[PDB]
Amino acid sequence: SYTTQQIIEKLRELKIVPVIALDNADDILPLADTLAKNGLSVAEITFRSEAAADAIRLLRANRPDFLIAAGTVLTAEQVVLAKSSGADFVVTPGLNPKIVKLCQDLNFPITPGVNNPMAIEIALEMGISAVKFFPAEASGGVKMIKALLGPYAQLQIMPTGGIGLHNIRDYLAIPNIVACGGSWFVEKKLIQSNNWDEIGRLVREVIDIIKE
Amino acid sequence: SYTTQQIIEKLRELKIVPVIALDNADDILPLADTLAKNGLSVAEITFRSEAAADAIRLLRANRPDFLIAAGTVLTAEQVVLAKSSGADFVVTPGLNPKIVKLCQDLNFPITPGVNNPMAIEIALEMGISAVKFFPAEASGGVKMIKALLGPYAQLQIMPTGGIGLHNIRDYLAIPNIVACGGSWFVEKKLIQSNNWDEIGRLVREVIDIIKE
Amino acid sequence: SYTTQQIIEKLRELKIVPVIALDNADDILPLADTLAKNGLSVAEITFRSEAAADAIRLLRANRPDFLIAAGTVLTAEQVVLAKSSGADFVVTPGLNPKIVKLCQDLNFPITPGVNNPMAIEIALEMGISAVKFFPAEASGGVKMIKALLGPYAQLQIMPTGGIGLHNIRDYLAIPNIVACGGSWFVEKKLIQSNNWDEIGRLVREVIDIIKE
């Protein structure tokens, strides 16, 4: 049971987080074996798919050490089920204060999404310094981030949205940016076709470009 | 009186809503005749004009089945006056929780405006799933809307701001987009000169473009 | 002591506000000197720098008629210290309702930052009509401002963020724009190397481009 800051530091070593949507929860086992084999033992499983909770539970049992996030959490029921399924922390696209307060009252780490100054100031008012920046590219990309970093100099940021091979290095060049999220290397059609080699290829490719 | 969901379904058949600002309230009659004749029996009368409430009243008396929205509603006094004037629903540029609650406590349909994830979360927390997206082009346009529809896949959106003949079809191609608001076919200068023929043509032009 | 409205009219005459980040408090005297000789008796001292309070106090004593703003104020302690040090008003990058209400409760003028309709409507609900627009360029610049001035036509705006010589005239051509904030003419390097002449040249350069 990692604290929020230990999770943040573990993400800082990883730098890229796969955002996984599944139609079939059993696909999480060969998928996670492929991610771990290629050096990424972390996954944000989206509640946009109904199979999310069962996948978190199966993965926790098979790989007790895997870093697991429940993503796109919008309701109190999802928080509760994310915690009992075994997730390590929660990720949300926006900041709904009842949802943030609930994770805090359950000692359940949460990285909420912000994209402007009002949202950042609500987060800082609730004791939160590590946030998701979403949607990254449509909200102004690297230019908006650098601008928000003038007055909010100690924010720890985790961007998601419109991030690919062509711009991941631009985001990772910024010291306050902890890690980026994306799904091009774990695309839904590749998971559905069980093409584990293509997935492992794309994983190695993003890992290489980052360490360039 | 129509419920909120019935109004959303009517707007979905119309697809384009005229946003009207006028100096002389009496012009709403020839203007609505011109809209009705050419296939568009709907109007959003903005409270940016002082002639707004008299125009809504006059129109409700002359054409009892016309769909009428009161736009730019920022105060409780305007909410109350829009209701007694006879408007079917309220439209707002942003989301003030006190104005939304009053409309819901008065059984008066309201489509408030948002442009980022924080504002969408508050709308969903207050039981609202049909929102105005404003200002649409300056907030990032179609690309910002598609990015928002990843996590909030059930929102029903009505874009306003920067919409014209050249981009109305790019917005209407997205399924969750109900209808768009626009003022170029009801330009103030044409209303000031009572140029009802040019208004009729512009309305027919957008209607045909959309059907294409 | 000036009221909030009196400060706004005072900024409407200056048109440009130096945003200063000092490492050494004593540098404020030679800086205030250069600025005051070249036509701008006004500064926004950031609490981003540890010696901000001493700088304001020193500057107030030496030139009691200078217009001083405490900027980047995020906590109640900062509000209380900015007032006892002698600042005329507070500038914030976003809008934290607890901070604004405390300034109003101490009769201390504040211009809070906004960049989207929801933040504007919270301001208006709090009786505020003069706001900082930040970060200006990254939020859509001149195009965002003009789209927001449609429904919020009485707003009084002060943009900051990406404002340079190449675009200050585009913002000042909008009547609701009171004055812009910038730091290129009082840049870090120039202060530390005590380049009072290079700074004085840039101040005249921007005042001239504005009045052209």
Domains assigned to chain A: 1-212 (3.20.20.70)
N residues, chain B: 212
Among all residues of chain A, which has the CA nearest to that of C46?
A151
Pick the catalytic residue from B9, B15, B37, B44.
B44
Residues of C near A (CB-CB distance < 8 A)? 48, 72, 74, 93-96, 98, 113-116, 118-119, 122, 134-135, 137-139, 161-162
Torsion region of B90: left, alpha or beta (phi above 0 gives left; psi -120 to 50 gives alpha): beta
Q: How far is B131 from chain A (nearest CA, A)?
A: 16
- Tell me if A60 is assigned to a ligand binding site: no
Phi, psi of C4 (to 5 degrees): -60, -45
Find which of C95, C96, C121, C122 to mutate to test the B interface (most B CBs within 10 Å of its CB): C121
Structural tokens at position A110: 């949460």
Distance CA B145, CA A138 (A): 9
Q: Are strands A16-20 and C130-133 parallel, antiparallel or unpaired?
A: unpaired
Query: Catalytic: which of A13, A132, A188, A211?
Result: A132
Q: Contact B96/C121, CB-based, under 8 Å?
A: yes
Closest CA to B132 of B172, B160, B97, B171: B160
Non-local (6+) Cβ contacts of A24 within 8 A are A51, A192
Alpha-carbon distance C70 to C79, whole Å? 9
Instruction: Please confirm, yes or no, whether C211 is among the known catalytic residues.
Output: no
User: Angle, to 10 degrees, between the axis of helix A117-125 and the axis of helix C117-125?
Assistant: 60
Q: Which of A194, A196, A179 is nearest to A14 (CA)?
A: A179
Q: Please, are residues B92 and B113 in contact by the beta-carbon 8 Å criterion?
A: yes
Surface-to-core class of residue C102, CB atoms within 10 Å of its CB (0-12 exposed, 13-18 middle, 19+ buried): middle
| CA separation for the pair C93, C95 (Å, rounded) | 7
Of C55, B140, C47, C17, nearest to A152 by C-alpha is C47
Peptide bond into A117 cis (omega under 30): no
| β-bridge partners, B113 | B132
DSSP β-bridge partners for residue B45: B20, B70
Listed residue (A46, A23, B118) closest to C94, CA to CA: B118
**Site from C46, C115, C148 to mutate, A interface, most A CB atoms within 10 angstroms:** C115
**Of A5, A40, A11, which is closest to residue A205 (Cα–Cα)?**
A40
CA proximity to B157, closest of B131, B139, B121, B138 = B131
For residue A68, give the 3-state DSSP assignment.
strand
CB contact set of A26 (below 8 Å; sequence gap of 6+): A58
Q: What angle do CA C185, C57, C135 make, to 5 degrees?
A: 40
For the question of residue A83 being annotated catalytic, the response is: no
Closest residue on chain B to C116 (Cα): B115
Please name the chains neighbouring A, where neighbouring means 3+ C-beta pairs under 8 angstroms: B, C
Distance from the C102 Cα atom to the nearest Cα atom in chain B, whole angstroms: 21
Candidates C50, C83, C98, C132; catalytic one: C132
B1-4: long-range contacts, CB 8 A cutoff, minimum separation 24: B1/B88, B1/B107, B2/B88, B2/B89, B2/B109, B3/B109, B4/B89, B4/B109, B4/B110, B4/B111, B4/B130
- H-helix segments, B90-180: 97-105, 117-125, 141-148, 168-172
Q: Are C43 and C68 in contact (CB under 8 A)?
A: yes
Q: Do B124 and A74 touch (CB under 8 A)?
A: yes
Residue C92, annotated as binding a ligand:
no
Q: Return the closest-CA partner of residue C54 out of C85, C87, C77.
A: C85
User: Is A72 labelled as part of a ligand binding site?
Assistant: yes
Cβ proximity of B3 and B9 under 8 Å: no
Give the span between the Cα atoms of C203 and A6, in whole angstroms: 48
How far is the C-alpha of B97 from the C-alpha of B158, rounded, in Å?
Answer: 19
Q: Which two tokens stand for residue B53?
A: 């409430």
Chain B contact residues (CB < 8 Å to A): 116-118, 120-122, 124-125, 140, 143-144, 147-148, 150-153
Q: How many residues does chain A have?
A: 212
Catalytic residue among A44, A83, A125, A212: A44
Contacts of C147 in chain B (CB under 8 A): 135, 137-138, 161-162
| CA B92 centroid distance within chain | 9
From B10, B132, B143, B146, the catalytic residue: B132
Q: Please tell me the distance from the alpha carbon of residue A126 to that of residue B17, in angstroms, as a whole number.
A: 41
CA distance linking residue B96 with residue B88, whole number of Å: 20
Asked if C115 and A120 come within 8 Å (Cβ–Cβ), the reply is no
Closest Cα partner for A145 from A181, A171, A127, A164?
Answer: A171
Chains touching B, CB cut-off 8 Å, 3+ pairs: A, C
Q: Closest by alpha carbon to A97, among A77, A112, A116?
A: A112
| Residues C184, B22: Cα–Cα separation, whole Å | 45
Question: Which residues of C touch chain B, with CB atoms under 8 Å apart?
Answer: 116-118, 120-122, 124-125, 140, 143-144, 147-148, 150-153
Pairing of strands A16-20, A180-182: parallel
Nearest-CA distance from C124 to chain A in Å?
A: 15
**Residue A139, phi then psi, degrees to nearest 5:** -80, 5
Q: Measuring CA to CA, which residue among B59, B9, B115 is closest to residue B69?
A: B59
CB atoms A125 and C93 under 8 Å: no
CB atoms within 10 A of CB B6: 12
**Separation of alpha carbons C173 and B122, rounded Å:** 35
Residues of chain A contacting residue B140, judged by C-beta atoms under 8 Å apart: 138-139
Rounded to the nearest angstrom, the minimum Cα separation between C96 and chain A is 6
Among C13, C15, C44, C98, the one annotated catalytic: C44
Neighbouring chains to C with at least 3 Cβ pairs closer than 8 Å: A, B
**Which one, of C114, C124, C176, lies nearest residue C146 by Cα?**
C176
Q: Show Cβ contacts of residue A20 under 8 Å, excluding neighbours closer than 6 positions.
A: A28, A31, A43, A44, A45, A46, A55, A183, A186, A191
Nearest to A110 by CA among A190, A2, A4: A4
* C18-28 residues labelled b (16+ CB within 10 A) or e (exposed): bbbbbeebebb
Tokens standing for residue A200 = 């492992």
Cβ–Cβ gap C117/B118 under 8 Å: no
Q: Do C151 and B48 touch (CB under 8 A)?
A: yes
Length of chain C equals 212
Interface mutation target, options A95, A114, A120, A121, chain C, most CBs of C under 10 Å:
A121
Axis crossing angle, helix A52-62 with helix A28-37, rounded to the nearest 10 = 50
User: Chain B closest CA to C18's CA: distance in Å?
Assistant: 28
Partner-chain residue, chosen from A125, A143, A153, that has the shortest CB–CB distance to C96: A125
- Among B97, B146, B90, B91, which residue's Cα sits nearest to residue B121? B97
SS (H, E, C) chain C: CCCHHHHHHHHHHHCEEEEECCCCHHHHHHHHHHHHHCCCCEEEEECCCCCHHHHHHHHHHHCCCCEEEEECCCCHHHHHHHHHHCCCEEECCCCCHHHHHHHHHCCCCEECEECCHHHHHHHHHCCCCEEEECCCHHHCHHHHHHHHCCCCCCCEEEEECCCCCCCHHHHHCCCCECCEEECHHHCHHHHHCCCHHHHHHHHHHHHHHHCC
Which residues in chain C are closer than 8 Å to A143, comparing Cβ atoms? 137-138
C-beta separation of A66 from A43 below 8 A: yes
Q: Which residues of chain C are within 8 Å of residue B113 when distances are taken between CB atoms? A: 117
> How was this structure obtained?
X-ray
Alpha-carbon distance of B191 to B173, in angstroms, equals: 31
